[PDB]
């Protein structure tokens with residue numbers, strides 16, 4: 001199957017918006033991590049492939065996904081980066097876990113539809 005850019009946007013953008021709607025849980029994920037602003041200079045030494053909601057949105061808007069699984073992979077990269085970097089007791093880690101639950105719920109019916 002070949003997927004057209006607007007087909008992917010129409011199907012997948014609502015799943016990304018579902019994450020944005022989580023407040024406060026999406027707040028640490030709405031923009032790229034800025035280690036200087038956040039006072040965490042070790043961030044890029046630990047996280048080699050940063051990813052965040054705004055980058056995923058831009059990739060959908062600019063047709064950079066050819067297959068739905070590539071979008072899923074970027075969302076999961078964002079989650080895995082946060083679980084790797086942040087401590088289990090931290091706000092960002094627990095917020096990540098909530099987003100992962102929401103994403104799992106929203107993405108499945110969409111994948112069944114395509």
Ligand SMILES: CC(=O)N1CCc2c(c(Nc3ccc(-c4cnn(C)c4)cc3F)nn2[C@H]2CCOC2)C1
Pocket residue numbers: 024027028029033038040081082085086091092
């Ligand atoms: C995604 C990721 O790995 N990050 C690396 C670590 C990090 C990140 C944010 N950002 C952030 C955190 C919390 C809130 C927030 C808003 N409302 N509430 C109740 C909480 C908003 C944010 F933008 N802080 N920290 C660290 C630095 C000091 O604090 C924890 C991003």
